[PDB]
Write a protein that binds this ligand. Sequence first.
Ligand code: HEM
Ligand SMILES: CCCCCCCCCCCCCC(=O)O
Ligand SMILES: *[C@@H]1O[C@H](CO)[C@@H](O)[C@H](O)[C@H]1NC(C)=O
Ligand SMILES: *[C@@H]1O[C@H](CO)[C@@H](O)[C@H](O)[C@H]1NC(C)=O
Ligand SMILES: *[C@@H]1O[C@H](CO)[C@@H](O)[C@H](O)[C@H]1NC(C)=O
Ligand SMILES: *[C@@H]1O[C@H](CO)[C@@H](O)[C@H](O)[C@H]1NC(C)=O
Ligand SMILES: *[C@@H]1O[C@H](CO)[C@@H](O)[C@H](O)[C@H]1NC(C)=O
Ligand SMILES: [Cl-]
Ligand SMILES: [Mg+2]
Length: 325
Amino acid sequence: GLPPGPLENSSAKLVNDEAHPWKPLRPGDIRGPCPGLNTLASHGYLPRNGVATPAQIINAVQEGFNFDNQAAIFLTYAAHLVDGNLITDLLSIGRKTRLTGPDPPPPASVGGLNEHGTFEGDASMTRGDAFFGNNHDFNETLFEQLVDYSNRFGGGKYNLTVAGELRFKRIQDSIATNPNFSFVDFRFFTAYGETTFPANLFVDGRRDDGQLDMDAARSFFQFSRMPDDFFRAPSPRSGTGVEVVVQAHPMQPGRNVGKINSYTVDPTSSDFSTPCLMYEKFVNITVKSLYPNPTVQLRKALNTNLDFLFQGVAAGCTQVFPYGR
Ligand code: HEM
Ligand SMILES: CCCCCCCCCCCCCC(=O)O
Ligand SMILES: *[C@@H]1O[C@H](CO)[C@@H](O)[C@H](O)[C@H]1NC(C)=O
Ligand SMILES: *[C@@H]1O[C@H](CO)[C@@H](O)[C@H](O)[C@H]1NC(C)=O
Ligand SMILES: *[C@@H]1O[C@H](CO)[C@@H](O)[C@H](O)[C@H]1NC(C)=O
Ligand SMILES: *[C@@H]1O[C@H](CO)[C@@H](O)[C@H](O)[C@H]1NC(C)=O
Ligand SMILES: *[C@@H]1O[C@H](CO)[C@@H](O)[C@H](O)[C@H]1NC(C)=O
Ligand SMILES: [Cl-]
Ligand SMILES: [Mg+2]
């Protein structure tokens, strides 16, 4: 389907409404590492079983949270290219499932958003690193660390100052304990953006003060549930304030080299000084390695979704064409 456009009416409004009640999971319902998508599925902005089309995801993040269009397009098509089924146009927001349809040939995995190292990655705030056995479920110990950092740096609330401190701690925790810790290219960028999302989109839009209370935080992160009478943000936004998080503790992209406490900077990795390189490497290396020699129908689907991905890329970058034009 074509990427949806921006909201016609982007005002704050009740999104926990009669048409979108929270419901508990049924057997087979899929939830994954993203509390935003999880909450939209659990309120029926997305299909409640957690399998959706890219267009459904873009409409849901806009309607439910006032996520901005360009950010919605970039993240959705990036996720779908590496984790979704390009022939059926379906993506799981969590585990791999037969519900995304017949699989493409190896080495493509169509693993859902749970797939480690495609979109999902290390030093998540409330989810453990994949090396420790579970990269998708809410983790109470990690959430209690978020509450502690909110008490120490946010007066009890999560805000961008807390984000800056927590983001760093999680990186340092992974360096100290995960011998396979990877923090380069796509993950490097998205990890920082994700820490702003609670302060920008989980805060009731009638306040929009960037101060997230811990009751609301737990509701979204653990139960995929909007607070009672939750109003969405009063304007489209995504990662505004990521500059504050980075400035708190500037880091170079890099990885542990098979041992703990061996963080080695990767000079081939993109960083905030090279955002177009991040896009080019995602397409020429990540997507191309999953689909090195696609058949006619897969090539067409890839090129279509790569065009859609480029719509979400900030002005100034050149489109790359791994399968030609
Ligand atoms: C637009 C499409 C979206 C996609 C494809 C997407 C995908 C993902 C994925 C795969 C992760 C896991 C990364 C990781 O931590 O390892 C993630 C994390 C996250 N997402 Fe989303 N997301 C989207 C939109 C949103 C929205 C609209 C919100 C908030 C309203 C949101 C909030 C978050 C948060 C807070 C995390 C971090 C969880 C943590 O570190 O504990 N996302 N997202
Ligand atoms: C992709 C970095 C995450 C930062 C959080 C804000 C979301 C913006 C989505 C990306 C839009 C432009 C991406 C690009 O120019 O490569
Ligand atoms: C836009 O939405 C607001 C509340 O969310 C509502 O008051 C207003 O009537 C709407 N405008 C249009 C275009 O219907
Ligand atoms: C280890 O890191 C590599 C990339 O460096 C990744 O492909 C692999 O899935 C990682 N394994 C775990 C469980 O972290
Ligand atoms: C949660 O994270 C903690 C701290 O990293 C870890 O020790 C624990 O094994 C994880 N899982 C659960 C189920 O608590
Ligand atoms: C976070 O809240 C605390 C206490 O109110 C404050 O010290 C800090 O400056 C706040 N940060 C932001 C971004 O408002
Ligand atoms: C991506 O591939 C295109 C050719 O399709 C090339 O022009 C560009 O330099 C490549 N970028 C990277 C980072 O490899
Ligand atoms: Cl928008
Ligand atoms: Mg993760």
